[PDB]
Amino acid sequence: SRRWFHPNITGVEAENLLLTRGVDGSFLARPSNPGDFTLSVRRNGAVTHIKIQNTGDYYDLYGGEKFATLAELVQYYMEHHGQLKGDVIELKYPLNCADPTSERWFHGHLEKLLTEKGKHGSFLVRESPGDFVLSVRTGSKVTHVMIRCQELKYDVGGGERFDSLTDLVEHYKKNPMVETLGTVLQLKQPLNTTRINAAEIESRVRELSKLQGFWEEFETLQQQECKLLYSRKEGQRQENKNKNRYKNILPFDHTRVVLHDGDPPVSDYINANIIMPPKKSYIATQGCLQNTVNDFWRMVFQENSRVIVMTTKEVERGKSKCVKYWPDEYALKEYGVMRVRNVKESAAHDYTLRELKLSKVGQGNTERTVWQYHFRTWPDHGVPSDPGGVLDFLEEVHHKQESIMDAGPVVVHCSAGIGRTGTFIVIDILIDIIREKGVDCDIDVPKTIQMVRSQRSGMVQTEAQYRFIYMAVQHYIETL
Ligand SMILES: COc1cccc(-c2nnc3n(Cc4ccccc4Cl)c(=O)c4ccccc4n23)c1O
Ligand SMILES: CC1(N)CCN(c2cnc(-c3cccc(Cl)c3Cl)c(N)n2)CC1
């Protein structure tokens, strides 16, 4: 669960919540300077507030580490004590949130939708006077169940009285209400309200811009991240620790890229994952370390990747984000058993193209051209104010990829390989649907993001990137 995340509370409410309803070791996380987060922890009778920053690359915890998601952060500290400080701060008891705002099925102030979009078991919860309504489709028909709110507790007119709409929903999801004549009121899935028809994007962007709707949709997607805590065991192995740019930002074992080139001990690891929406697949990876440059070229060669998308400068804010893993123009370099020639570099406004020739040493016939698209103008923090540059760049990448027969997955990387990486990949997936199926196609942005996030942790980091994806898709349809 992710009940420890409270979306609409202040620092004062948080302090009072932890003092009156918590104990020592009680904790909660909350949004702020908007775009930032706070981890509020009770310790020795008093509340400590810890800053969490995210400008688009990772969740940066003060006095702690950098993480892909808030759920990964909480899971880690609840399992590794003595790590948060210089007195140790323990995350023992999540203080649960009763607010239903970030639930997929909660539609506050709101049958047309269930008739049009719904299927058997599609449900929603709306506010009635102070009471709520549970509307379910079965088949086919729609049934409305009244939810009474009496002294901070919720009930369906008998039986148990719940502390939150969530507890009631979870209960009647496991134990369905049966109508007198036998209709089982199964709460299968929440009603889909995010899937839009591509041609109606401008309309959706207008409605999400109203007091904002983009924040509520993004935070509802963030609440689903607790379902994506897959094992990242291989990246924890002693011999793999120095192969990670950020020790706690790890690739899922079920999608990680396994290297078989193998110098005959532990030669099979790279912090990278296959992303499936081979030719229209991606590899989402981190910016190279000096000790992973050889592994990066073994991955590119093994996977038959012909295109690399680099979305960071080598150095940003005086910090190394990616080592230069390619030779200077006209130069030839050996990176272990791999040989790379930089044939030619071409400078465009927002990016540089580098034509590379990759081959395995001692095997001339293994040579293939690798096109490196280096996006150089992405700001240090936040996102571009206009998506035109990113779309023009992606259009170019897409055509290069399409022109190459049996090209392997597109390699995409930034610093941690989750924020800008996930943003470019999600835009590229969404735009590809519009290429294939046309302006009259269905697109579902959080659905696409959730699908990508089950393949690599925290793909798409911020609300700013989330709004950027909608803005990019809107701009691509406007130029069609
Ligand atoms: C079905 O799911 C799983 C099955 C097996 C292992 C994992 C697993 N993989 N990584 C972690 N890390 C993350 C982690 C660990 C050590 C060093 C750095 C990091 Cl960043 C935890 O802190 C953790 C804590 C509690 C439980 C599982 C955890 N876990 C998993 O999720
Ligand atoms: C008003 C409201 N409480 C906030 C917006 N809203 C929703 C609904 N569903 C998703 C969704 C869609 C597909 C996959 C995933 Cl994982 C998610 Cl979470 C979403 N992000 N927001 C409707 C309810």
Curated annotation (Swiss-Prot):
Q: Which GO terms describe its biological process?
A: atrioventricular canal development; axonogenesis; Bergmann glial cell differentiation; brain development; cellular response to epidermal growth factor stimulus; cellular response to mechanical stimulus; cerebellar cortex formation; cytokine-mediated signaling pathway
Partners and quaternary state? Interacts with phosphorylated LIME1 and BCAR3. Interacts with SHB and INPP5D/SHIP1. Interacts with MILR1 (tyrosine-phosphorylated). Interacts with FLT1 (tyrosine-phosphorylated), FLT3 (tyrosine-phosphorylated), FLT4 (tyrosine-phosphorylated), KIT and GRB2. Interacts with PDGFRA (tyrosine phosphorylated). Interacts (via SH2 domain) with TEK/TIE2 (tyrosine phosphorylated). Interacts with PTPNS1 and CD84. Interacts with phosphorylated SIT1 and MPZL1. Interacts with FCRL4, FCRL6 and ANKHD1. Interacts with KIR2DL1; the interaction is enhanced by ARRB2. Interacts with GAB2.
What organism is the protein native to?
Homo sapiens
Residues reported in the UniProt entry to bind substrate: D380, C414, S415, A416, G417, I418, G419, R420, Q461
| Outcome of mutating L228F | In NS1; increases MAPK signaling; increases protein tyrosine phosphatase activity; changed substrate selectivity for GAB1
Residues forming the Tyrosine-protein phosphatase domain are: 214-472
Q: Where in the cell is it found?
A: Cytoplasm; Nucleus
Q: Which comment does the entry carry about domains?
A: The SH2 domains repress phosphatase activity. Binding of these domains to phosphotyrosine-containing proteins relieves this auto-inhibition, possibly by inducing a conformational change in the enzyme.
- What EC number(s) would the UniProt record show? 3.1.3.48
Q: What is the effect of changing R232Q?
A: In NS1; increases MAPK signaling; increased protein tyrosine phosphatase activity
Q: Mutating I274V: what's the consequence?
A: In NS1; benign
In the UniProt record, the gene name given for this protein reads: PTPN11
What protein is this chain from? Tyrosine-protein phosphatase non-receptor type 11
